[PDB]
Nucleic acid binder design. Structure first.
Ligand SMILES: Nc1ccc2cc3ccc(N)cc3nc2c1
Ligand SMILES: [Mg+2]
Ligand SMILES: [Mg+2]
Ligand SMILES: [Mg+2]
Lengths: 215, 225
RNA sequence: GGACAAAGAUAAAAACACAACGUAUGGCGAAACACGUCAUACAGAUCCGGUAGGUAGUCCGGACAUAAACAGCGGAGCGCUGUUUAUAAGUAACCUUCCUCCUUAGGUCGUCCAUUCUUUGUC
């Protein structure tokens, strides 16, 4: 039977100087054969802790590791701006090796309302034979937001794809784009298209809409 | 001084074979365990395979058992991962890692490569079709409007987007590409500009897709009335 | 006094040779497994009877314990249970008694200790 490593929490929000703890629970004994790593987006992981308590050469002291039974914790005594990354735990007691699902450490910030814009399909795209309508939610925090597309005030499901940016270096906010892809004919069968955003910063749903064939 | 460089990734069709290499420098692979770990785009690390020192013992994960072979060539100081009968789920960045000395670093992986991308897909290289996202015809909210381009139906990655030939770099968000049901990628790049400039200033996005040899400059302007 | 006899108490006591693979755990070797090396442990010298009175780590016989092979049971592999076999060569070799034409053998009888003192019966 393979060993499972369950990492909690999947995502954590904290500020510079915070003490952070991430835990990993093993389905069976793994003794002390546990390691932790830090992967910054687009970069290879870097070894942080080995043998589940030992600090790897050259790693900052603030990072520590503790073992209680089959539970292992990684602790940063005081966060620094360079310490915001995804963190992984790994067991190496028995093959096959297994990794934790990861924990992303993000900057904590003021609740920020999204600025919402709606872009109608371009004429070149309708000449190409497809229609895409793009909603943009700009500079908002936290990353938890919802977009409800409405064609002629009719809710649409399964035709919308979303994409979110990594937290900004300066504003520490996330931006989201939602794209609704409809057939050119279907885009030409409906007169009203709206984007409804429900976010914590938004006291009420904020909707930005256009009509088919209007300026 | 210690370095690992993976190579040999790329795009392969489902059911096809690929062979990854991990060239080492600053150490001899015979005295260490070598591991291959893959990371699917937007997903976590997944251990793939390992080779032990002085025995050649090979260990694999269930997801790859029977289809992957890990080997080592000491004279070329290089590890290898042979993948046969590949499928879309194998698409990932593959790192090779050195396992550290047990006395110094336990069983942790102390050095990794930059990774190499493996894309399993039947899609053919397509040049991106860049469309224009017009700034709001109505007055913008906040006094700054948003104008963007849509780089849609391009394979494979990556694309590069500049604005005004790179003169406009502040406030631009290029979104991560999303794979659509077609198997082709799509993304959008948007910029916020002062609304006073929308009629006075012309905004162009420059999209480059080197794999297809595609350079496009698309002008985004407000629409009629 | 001495002799024979029985019954007691006491003491004694087996030659030569006794091997060689390997397994497990842990440490170390640039070392999760394999490999090499070192340390430690295991690798029937348990119990009983007999062997014309006695002496067995090695006999003969049996039991038990432990290991291997085979059979059965439960959820190919894995774990147990039951049976068989094994646990040196060797009670081989030499010497020796008897028997058998397995006779250039096979079996079998021996190889060691049995001292000292006490009581009684009859000469
Ligand atoms: N070599 C031998 C031969 C026969 C033996 C017979 C014995 C009978 C009883 C005992 N206690 C020890 C014995 N030892 C013997 C040693
Ligand atoms: Mg006896
Ligand atoms: Mg003796
Ligand atoms: Mg015998």
């Amino acid at each position: 039977s393979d060993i499972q490593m369950t990492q909690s929490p999947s995502s954590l929000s904290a500020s510079v100087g915070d003490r952070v703890t991430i835990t990993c629970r093993a389905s069976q004994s793994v003794s002390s054969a546990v390691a932790w790593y830090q992967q910054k987006p687009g970069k290879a992981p870097k070894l942080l802790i080995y043998s589940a308590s030992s600090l790897y050469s050259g790693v900052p002291s603030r990072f520590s590791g503790s073992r209680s039974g089959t539970d292992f914790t990684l602790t940063i005594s005081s966060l620094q701006p360079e310490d915001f990354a995804t963190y992984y735990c790994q067991q190496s007691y028995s093959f096959p090796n297994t990794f934790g699902q990861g924990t992303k450490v993000e900057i904590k910030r003021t609740v920020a309302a999204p600025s919402v814009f709606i872009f109608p399909p371009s004429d070149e795209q309708l000449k190409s034979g497809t229609a895409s309508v793009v909603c943009l939610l700009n500079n908002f925090y936290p990353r938890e937001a919802k977009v409800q597309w409405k064609v002629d005030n009719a809710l649409q499901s399964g035709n919308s794809q979303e994409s979110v940016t990594e937290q900004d270096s300066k504003d520490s906010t996330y931006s989201l784009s939602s794209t609704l892809t409809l057939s050119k004919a279907d885009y030409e069968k409906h007169k009203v298209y709206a984007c409804e955003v429900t976010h914590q910063g938004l006291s009420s749903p904020v909707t930005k809409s256009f009509n088919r064939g209007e300026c | 001084e210690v370095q690992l460089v993976e190579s040999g990734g790329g795009l392969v069709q489902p059911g096809g074979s690929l062979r990854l290499s991990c060239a080492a420098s600053g150490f001899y692979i015979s005295y260490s365990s070598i591991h291959w770990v893959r990371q699917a785009p937007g997903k976590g690390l997944e251990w793939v395979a390992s080779i032990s020192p002085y025995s050649g013992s090979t260990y694999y994960a269930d997801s790859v058992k029977g289809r992957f072979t890990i080997s080592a060539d000491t004279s070329k100081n290089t590890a290898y991962l042979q993948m046969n009968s590949l499928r879309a789920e194998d698409t990932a960045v593959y790192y090779c890692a050195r396992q550290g000395y047990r006395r110094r670093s336990g069983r942790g992986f102390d050095y990794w490569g930059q990774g190499t991308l493996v894309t399993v897909s039947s899609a053919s290289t397509k040049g991106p079709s860049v469309f224009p996202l017009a700034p709001s015809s109505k007055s913008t909210s906040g006094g700054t409007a948003a104008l963007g381009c849509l780089v849609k139906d391009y394979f494979p990655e990556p694309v590069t987007v500049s604005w005004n030939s790179g003169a406009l770099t502040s406030g631009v968000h290029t979104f991560p590409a999303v794979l659509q049901s077609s198997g082709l990628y799509s993304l959008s790049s948007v910029v916020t500009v002062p609304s006073s400039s929308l009629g006075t200033q012309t905004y162009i996005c420059n999209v480059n897709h080197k794999p297809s040899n595609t350079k496009v400059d698309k002008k985004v302007e407000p629409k009629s009335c």
